[PDB]
PDB file of C-alpha atoms and ligand atoms in Angstrom:
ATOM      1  CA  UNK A   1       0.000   0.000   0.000  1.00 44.05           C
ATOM      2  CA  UNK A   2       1.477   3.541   0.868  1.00 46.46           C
ATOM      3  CA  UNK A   3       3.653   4.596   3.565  1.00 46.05           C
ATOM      4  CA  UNK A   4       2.484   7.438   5.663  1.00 45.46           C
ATOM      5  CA  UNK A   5       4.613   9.490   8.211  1.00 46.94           C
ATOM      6  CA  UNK A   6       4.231   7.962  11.685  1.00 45.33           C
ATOM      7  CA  UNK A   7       2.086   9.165  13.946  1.00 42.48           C
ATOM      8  CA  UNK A   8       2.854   7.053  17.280  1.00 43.89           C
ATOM      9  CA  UNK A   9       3.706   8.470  20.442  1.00 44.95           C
ATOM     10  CA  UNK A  10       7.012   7.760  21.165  1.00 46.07           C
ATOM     11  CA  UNK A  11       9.362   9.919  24.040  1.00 45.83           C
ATOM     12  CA  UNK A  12      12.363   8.228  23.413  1.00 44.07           C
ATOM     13  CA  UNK A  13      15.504   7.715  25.869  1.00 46.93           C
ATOM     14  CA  UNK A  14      15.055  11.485  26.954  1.00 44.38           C
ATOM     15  CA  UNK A  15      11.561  11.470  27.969  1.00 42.40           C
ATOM     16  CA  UNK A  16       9.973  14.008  25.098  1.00 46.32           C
ATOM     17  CA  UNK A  17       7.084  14.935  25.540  1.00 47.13           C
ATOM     18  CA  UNK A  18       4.902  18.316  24.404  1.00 44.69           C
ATOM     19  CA  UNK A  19       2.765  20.334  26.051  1.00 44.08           C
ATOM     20  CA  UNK A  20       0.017  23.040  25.664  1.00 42.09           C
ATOM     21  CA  UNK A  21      -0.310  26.476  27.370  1.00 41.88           C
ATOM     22  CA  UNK A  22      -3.414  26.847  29.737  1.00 39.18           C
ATOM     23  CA  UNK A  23      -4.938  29.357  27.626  1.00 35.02           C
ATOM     24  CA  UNK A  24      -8.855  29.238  28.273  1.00 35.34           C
ATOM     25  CA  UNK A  25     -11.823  29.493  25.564  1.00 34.42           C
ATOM     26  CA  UNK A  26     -12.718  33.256  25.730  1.00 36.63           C
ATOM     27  CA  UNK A  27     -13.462  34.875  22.659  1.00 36.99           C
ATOM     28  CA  UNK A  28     -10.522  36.733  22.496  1.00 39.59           C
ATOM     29  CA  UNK A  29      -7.549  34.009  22.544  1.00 45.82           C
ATOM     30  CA  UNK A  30      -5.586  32.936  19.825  1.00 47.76           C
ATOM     31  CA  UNK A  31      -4.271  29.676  20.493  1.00 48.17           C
ATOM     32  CA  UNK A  32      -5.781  27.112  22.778  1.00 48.73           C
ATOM     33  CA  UNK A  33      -5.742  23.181  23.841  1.00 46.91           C
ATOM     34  CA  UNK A  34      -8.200  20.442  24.654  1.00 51.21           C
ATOM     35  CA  UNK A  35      -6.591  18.129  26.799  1.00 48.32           C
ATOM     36  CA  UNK A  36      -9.968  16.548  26.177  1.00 48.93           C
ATOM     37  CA  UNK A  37      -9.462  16.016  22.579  1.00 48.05           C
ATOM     38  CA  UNK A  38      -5.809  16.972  22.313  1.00 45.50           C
ATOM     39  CA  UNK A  39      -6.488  19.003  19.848  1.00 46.27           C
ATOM     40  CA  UNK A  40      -4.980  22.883  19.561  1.00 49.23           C
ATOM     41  CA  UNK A  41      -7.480  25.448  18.312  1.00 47.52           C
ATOM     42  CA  UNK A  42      -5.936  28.513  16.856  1.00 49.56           C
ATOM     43  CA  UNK A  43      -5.960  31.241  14.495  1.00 52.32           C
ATOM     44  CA  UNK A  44      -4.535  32.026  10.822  1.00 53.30           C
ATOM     45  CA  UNK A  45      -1.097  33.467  11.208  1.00 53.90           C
ATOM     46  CA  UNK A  46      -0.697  33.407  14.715  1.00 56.91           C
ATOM     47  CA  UNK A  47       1.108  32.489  17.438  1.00 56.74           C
ATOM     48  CA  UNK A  48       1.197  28.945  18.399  1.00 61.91           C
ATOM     49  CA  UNK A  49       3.032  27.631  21.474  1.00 66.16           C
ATOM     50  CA  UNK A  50       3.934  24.258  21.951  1.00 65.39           C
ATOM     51  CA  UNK A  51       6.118  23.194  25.034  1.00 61.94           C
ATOM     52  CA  UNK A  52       8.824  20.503  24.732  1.00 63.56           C
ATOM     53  CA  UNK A  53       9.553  18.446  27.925  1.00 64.59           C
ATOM     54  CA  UNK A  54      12.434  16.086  28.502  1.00 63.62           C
ATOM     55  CA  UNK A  55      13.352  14.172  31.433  1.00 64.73           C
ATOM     56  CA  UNK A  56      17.047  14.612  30.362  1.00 65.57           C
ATOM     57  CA  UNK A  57      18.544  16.795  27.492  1.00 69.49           C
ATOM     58  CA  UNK A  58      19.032  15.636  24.262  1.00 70.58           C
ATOM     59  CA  UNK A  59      22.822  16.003  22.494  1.00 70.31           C
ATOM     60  CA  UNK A  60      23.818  19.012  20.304  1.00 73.19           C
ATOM     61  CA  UNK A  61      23.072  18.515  17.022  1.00 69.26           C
ATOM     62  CA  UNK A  62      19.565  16.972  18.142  1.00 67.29           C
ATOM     63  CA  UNK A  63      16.530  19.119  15.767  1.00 67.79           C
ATOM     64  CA  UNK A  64      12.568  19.446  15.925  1.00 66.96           C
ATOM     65  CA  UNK A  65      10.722  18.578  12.949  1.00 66.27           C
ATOM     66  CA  UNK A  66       7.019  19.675  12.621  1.00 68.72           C
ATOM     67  CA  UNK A  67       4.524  18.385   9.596  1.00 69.04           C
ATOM     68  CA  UNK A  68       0.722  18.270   9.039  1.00 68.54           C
ATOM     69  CA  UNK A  69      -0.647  15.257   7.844  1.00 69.08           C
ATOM     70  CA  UNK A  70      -4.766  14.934   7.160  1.00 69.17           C
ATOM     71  CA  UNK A  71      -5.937  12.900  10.574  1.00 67.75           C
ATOM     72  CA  UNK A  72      -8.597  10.055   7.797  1.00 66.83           C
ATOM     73  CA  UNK A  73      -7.168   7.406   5.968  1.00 66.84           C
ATOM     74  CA  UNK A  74      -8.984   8.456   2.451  1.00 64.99           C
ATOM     75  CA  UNK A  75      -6.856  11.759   2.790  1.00 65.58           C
ATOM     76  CA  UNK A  76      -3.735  10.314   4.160  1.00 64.61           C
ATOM     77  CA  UNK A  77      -1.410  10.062   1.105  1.00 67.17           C
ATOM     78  CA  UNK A  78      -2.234  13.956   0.297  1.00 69.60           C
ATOM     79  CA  UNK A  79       0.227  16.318   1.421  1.00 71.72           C
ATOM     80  CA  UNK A  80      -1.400  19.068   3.435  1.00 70.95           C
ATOM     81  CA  UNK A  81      -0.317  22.222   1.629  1.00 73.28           C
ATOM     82  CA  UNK A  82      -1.366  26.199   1.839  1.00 76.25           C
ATOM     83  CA  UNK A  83      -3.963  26.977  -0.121  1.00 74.11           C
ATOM     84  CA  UNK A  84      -2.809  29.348  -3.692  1.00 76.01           C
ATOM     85  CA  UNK A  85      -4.957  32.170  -1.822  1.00 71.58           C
ATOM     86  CA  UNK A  86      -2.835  32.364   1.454  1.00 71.67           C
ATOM     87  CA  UNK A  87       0.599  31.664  -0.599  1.00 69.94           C
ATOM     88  CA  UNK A  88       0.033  35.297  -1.538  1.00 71.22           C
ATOM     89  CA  UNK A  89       0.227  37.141   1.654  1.00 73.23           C
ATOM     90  CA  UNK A  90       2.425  39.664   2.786  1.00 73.08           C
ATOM     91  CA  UNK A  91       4.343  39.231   5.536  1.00 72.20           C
ATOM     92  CA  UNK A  92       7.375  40.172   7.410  1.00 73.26           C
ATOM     93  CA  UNK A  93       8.852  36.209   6.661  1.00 75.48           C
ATOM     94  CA  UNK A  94      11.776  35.701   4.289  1.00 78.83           C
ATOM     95  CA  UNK A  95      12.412  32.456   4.688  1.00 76.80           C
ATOM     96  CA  UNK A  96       9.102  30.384   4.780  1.00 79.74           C
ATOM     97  CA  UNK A  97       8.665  28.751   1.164  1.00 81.46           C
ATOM     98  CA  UNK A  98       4.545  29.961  -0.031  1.00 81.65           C
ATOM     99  CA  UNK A  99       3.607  26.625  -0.180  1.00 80.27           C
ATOM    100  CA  UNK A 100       4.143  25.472   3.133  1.00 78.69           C
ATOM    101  CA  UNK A 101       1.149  25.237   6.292  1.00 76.62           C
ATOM    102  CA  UNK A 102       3.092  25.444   9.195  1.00 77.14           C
ATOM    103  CA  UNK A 103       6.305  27.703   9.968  1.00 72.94           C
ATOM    104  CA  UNK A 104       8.508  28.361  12.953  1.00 71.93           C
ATOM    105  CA  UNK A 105       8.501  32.141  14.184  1.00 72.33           C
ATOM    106  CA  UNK A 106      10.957  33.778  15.873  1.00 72.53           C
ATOM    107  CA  UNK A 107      13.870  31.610  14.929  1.00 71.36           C
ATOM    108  CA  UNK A 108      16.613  32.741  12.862  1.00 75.30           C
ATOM    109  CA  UNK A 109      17.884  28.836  12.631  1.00 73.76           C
ATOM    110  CA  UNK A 110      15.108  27.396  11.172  1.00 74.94           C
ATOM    111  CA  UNK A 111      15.103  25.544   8.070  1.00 75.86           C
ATOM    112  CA  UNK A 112      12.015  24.413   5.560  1.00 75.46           C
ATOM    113  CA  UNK A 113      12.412  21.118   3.368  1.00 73.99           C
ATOM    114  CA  UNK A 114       9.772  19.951   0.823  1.00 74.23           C
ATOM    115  CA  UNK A 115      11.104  16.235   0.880  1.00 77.00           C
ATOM    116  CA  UNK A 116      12.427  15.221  -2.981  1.00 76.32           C
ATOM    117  CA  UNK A 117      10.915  11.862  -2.329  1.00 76.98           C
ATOM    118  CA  UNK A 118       7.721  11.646  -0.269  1.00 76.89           C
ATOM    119  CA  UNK A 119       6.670  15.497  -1.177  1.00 73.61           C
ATOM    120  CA  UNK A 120       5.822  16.260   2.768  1.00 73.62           C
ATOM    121  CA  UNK A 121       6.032  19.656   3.821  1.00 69.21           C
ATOM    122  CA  UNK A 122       8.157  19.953   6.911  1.00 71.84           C
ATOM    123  CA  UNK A 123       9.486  22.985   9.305  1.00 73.48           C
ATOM    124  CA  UNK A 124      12.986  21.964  11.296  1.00 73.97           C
ATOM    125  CA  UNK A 125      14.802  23.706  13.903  1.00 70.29           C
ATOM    126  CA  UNK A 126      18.093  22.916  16.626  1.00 69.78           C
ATOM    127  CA  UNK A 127      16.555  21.791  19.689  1.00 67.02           C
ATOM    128  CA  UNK A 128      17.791  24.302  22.472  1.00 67.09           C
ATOM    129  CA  UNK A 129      17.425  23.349  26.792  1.00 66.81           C
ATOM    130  CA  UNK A 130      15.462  25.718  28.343  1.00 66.92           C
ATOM    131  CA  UNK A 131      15.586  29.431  28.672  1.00 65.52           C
ATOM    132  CA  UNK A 132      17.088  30.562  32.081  1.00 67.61           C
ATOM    133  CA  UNK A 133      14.642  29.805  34.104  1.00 64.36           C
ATOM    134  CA  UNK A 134      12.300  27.785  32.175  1.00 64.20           C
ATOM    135  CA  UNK A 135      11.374  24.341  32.851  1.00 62.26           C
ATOM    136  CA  UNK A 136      10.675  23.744  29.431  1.00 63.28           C
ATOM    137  CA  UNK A 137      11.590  24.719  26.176  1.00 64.71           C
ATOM    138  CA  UNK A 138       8.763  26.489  23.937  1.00 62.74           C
ATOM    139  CA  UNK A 139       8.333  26.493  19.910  1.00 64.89           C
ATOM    140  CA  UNK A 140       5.983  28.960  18.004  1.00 61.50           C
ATOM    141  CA  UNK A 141       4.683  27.891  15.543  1.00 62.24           C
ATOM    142  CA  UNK A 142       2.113  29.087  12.915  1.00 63.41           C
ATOM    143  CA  UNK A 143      -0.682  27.751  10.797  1.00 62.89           C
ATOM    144  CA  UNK A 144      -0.793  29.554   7.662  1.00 60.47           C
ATOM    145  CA  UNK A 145      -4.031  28.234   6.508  1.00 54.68           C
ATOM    146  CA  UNK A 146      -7.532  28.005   7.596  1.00 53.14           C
ATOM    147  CA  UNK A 147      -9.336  24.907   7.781  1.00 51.93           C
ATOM    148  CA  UNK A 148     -12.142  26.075   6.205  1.00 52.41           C
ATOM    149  CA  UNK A 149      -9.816  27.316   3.318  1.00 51.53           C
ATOM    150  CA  UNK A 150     -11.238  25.590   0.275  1.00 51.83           C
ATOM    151  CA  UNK A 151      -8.566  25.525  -2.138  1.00 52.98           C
ATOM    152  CA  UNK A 152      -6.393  23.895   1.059  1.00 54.32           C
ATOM    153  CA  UNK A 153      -7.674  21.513   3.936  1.00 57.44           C
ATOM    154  CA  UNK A 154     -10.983  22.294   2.366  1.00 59.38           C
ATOM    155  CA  UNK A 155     -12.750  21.053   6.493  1.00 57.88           C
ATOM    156  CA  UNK A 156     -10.593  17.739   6.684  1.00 60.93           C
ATOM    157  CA  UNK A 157      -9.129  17.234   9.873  1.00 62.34           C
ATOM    158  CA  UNK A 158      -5.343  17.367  10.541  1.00 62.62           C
ATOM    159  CA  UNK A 159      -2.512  16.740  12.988  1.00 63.04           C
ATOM    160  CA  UNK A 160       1.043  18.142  13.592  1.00 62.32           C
ATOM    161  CA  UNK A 161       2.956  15.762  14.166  1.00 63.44           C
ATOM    162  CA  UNK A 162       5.903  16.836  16.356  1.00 63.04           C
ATOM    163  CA  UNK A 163       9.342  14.862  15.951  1.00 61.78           C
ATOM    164  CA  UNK A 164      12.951  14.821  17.761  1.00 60.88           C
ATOM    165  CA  UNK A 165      15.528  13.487  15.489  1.00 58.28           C
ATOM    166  CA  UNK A 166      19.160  13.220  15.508  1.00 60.01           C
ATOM    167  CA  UNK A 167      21.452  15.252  13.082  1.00 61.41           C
ATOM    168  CA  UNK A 168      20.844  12.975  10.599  1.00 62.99           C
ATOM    169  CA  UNK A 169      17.349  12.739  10.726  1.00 62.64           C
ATOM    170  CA  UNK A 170      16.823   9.458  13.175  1.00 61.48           C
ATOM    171  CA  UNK A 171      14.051   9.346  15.369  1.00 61.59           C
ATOM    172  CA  UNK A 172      14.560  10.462  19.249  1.00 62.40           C
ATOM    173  CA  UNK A 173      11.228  10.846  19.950  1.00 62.26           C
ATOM    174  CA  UNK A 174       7.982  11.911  18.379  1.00 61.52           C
ATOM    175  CA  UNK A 175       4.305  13.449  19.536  1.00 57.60           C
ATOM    176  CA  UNK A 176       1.363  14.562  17.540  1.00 58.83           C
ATOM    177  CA  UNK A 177      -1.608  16.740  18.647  1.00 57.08           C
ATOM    178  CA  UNK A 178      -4.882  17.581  16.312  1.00 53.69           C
ATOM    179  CA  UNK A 179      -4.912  20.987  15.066  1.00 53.57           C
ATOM    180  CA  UNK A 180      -8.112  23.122  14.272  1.00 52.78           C
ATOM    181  CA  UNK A 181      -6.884  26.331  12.255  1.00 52.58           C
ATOM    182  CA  UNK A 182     -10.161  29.339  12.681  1.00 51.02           C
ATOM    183  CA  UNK A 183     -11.076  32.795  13.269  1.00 47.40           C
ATOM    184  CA  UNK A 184     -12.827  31.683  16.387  1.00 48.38           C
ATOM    185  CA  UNK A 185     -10.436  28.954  18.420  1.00 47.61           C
ATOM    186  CA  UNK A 186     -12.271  29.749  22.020  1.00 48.60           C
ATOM    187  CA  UNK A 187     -15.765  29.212  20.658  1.00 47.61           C
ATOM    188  CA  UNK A 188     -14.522  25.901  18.616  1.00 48.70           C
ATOM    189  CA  UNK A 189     -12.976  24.389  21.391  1.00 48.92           C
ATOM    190  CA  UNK A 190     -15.834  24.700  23.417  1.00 48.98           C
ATOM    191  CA  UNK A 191     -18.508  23.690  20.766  1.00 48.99           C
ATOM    192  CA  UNK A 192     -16.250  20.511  20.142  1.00 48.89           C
ATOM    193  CA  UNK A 193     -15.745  20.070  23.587  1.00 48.59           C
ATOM    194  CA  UNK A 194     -19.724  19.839  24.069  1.00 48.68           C
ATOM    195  CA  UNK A 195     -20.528  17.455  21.199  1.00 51.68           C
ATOM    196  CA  UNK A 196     -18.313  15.366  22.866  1.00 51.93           C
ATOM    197  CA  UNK A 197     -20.194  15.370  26.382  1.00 53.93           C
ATOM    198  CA  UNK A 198     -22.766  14.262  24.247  1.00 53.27           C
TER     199      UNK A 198
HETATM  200 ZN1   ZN B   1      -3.343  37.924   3.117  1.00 55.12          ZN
HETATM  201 ZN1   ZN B   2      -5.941  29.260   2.856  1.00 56.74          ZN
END
């Protein structure tokens, strides 16, 4: 049949693991989680933080790969892409390719690859130990996309799947969350957190 990228938990020999800031479901936010669903609701172009945890830190050289895949087998094999609309924004990013859903912000380091042989989109950066002070060490990402967006996801589910890897590209460890990209996150999350108490 066909290969798709992994998707199983996995926190490796240093204990990777991600996690979500508590960010509640008022109107206003921009990014938030269901532990409920694991699934991060946020909006177009913003800030998305997601926390890496490890029991014990992993080697220099060690990187942080992030890539959308579409969460139903019928839509597996596509590669989750921008849609031709949003590859036409202007923004302050040099580096980001047009084509590519999810980028790294605030990271001088980071590096995009559209693989020559599977076609995935993917956004890779050095894995750093936590700021002073900081239990934890945080990347921000962004969705450049909506779900709704039909000429992209077109309403098909997705998840990010989150992977350590050596300097080589050999898995250390790897996480995945469902993300919901819309102008709305707080009032998503809860909606989808009702239908499922019922
Ligand atoms: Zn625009
Ligand atoms: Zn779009």
């Amino acid at each position: 049949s066909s290969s798709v990228p992994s998707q199983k938990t996995y926190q490796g020999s240093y204990g990777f693991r991600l996690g979500f800031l508590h960010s509640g479901t008022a109107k206003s936010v921009t990014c938030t989680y269901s532990p409920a669903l694991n699934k991060m609701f946020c909006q177009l172009a913003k800030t998305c933080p997601v926390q890496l945890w490890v029991d014990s830190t992993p080697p220099p050289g060690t990187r942080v790969r992030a890539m959308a895949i579409y969460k139903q087998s019928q839509h597996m094999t596509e590669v989750v892409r921008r849609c031709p609309h949003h590859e036409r924004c202007s923004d302050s990013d040099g580096l980001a390719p047009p084509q590519h859903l999810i980028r790294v912000e605030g990271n001088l380091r980071v590096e995009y690859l559209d693989d020559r042989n599977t076609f995935r989109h993917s956004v890779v950066v050095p894995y750093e130990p936590p700021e002073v002070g900081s239990d934890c060490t945080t990347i921000h990402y962004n969705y450049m996309c909506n779900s709704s967006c039909m000429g992209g996801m077109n309403r098909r589910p997705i998840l990010t799947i989150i992977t350590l890897e050596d300097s080589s590209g050999n898995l250390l460890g790897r996480n995945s969350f469902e993300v919901h990209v819309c102008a709305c996150p707080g009032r998503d999350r809860r909606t989808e957190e009702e239908n499922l108490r019922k």
